[PDB]
Amino acid sequence: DCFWKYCV
């Protein structure tokens, strides 16, 4: 799941 500073 894409979230905060993360996209996986």
From Swiss-Prot:
Compartments, as annotated in UniProt: Secreted
Tissue occurrence: Brain specific.
GN (gene name): UTS2
Identification of the protein by name: Urotensin-2
Function: Highly potent vasoconstrictor.
Cystine residue pairs: 2-7
Range covered out of full length: 117 to 124 of 124
Domain of life: Eukaryota
Family: Belongs to the urotensin-2 family.
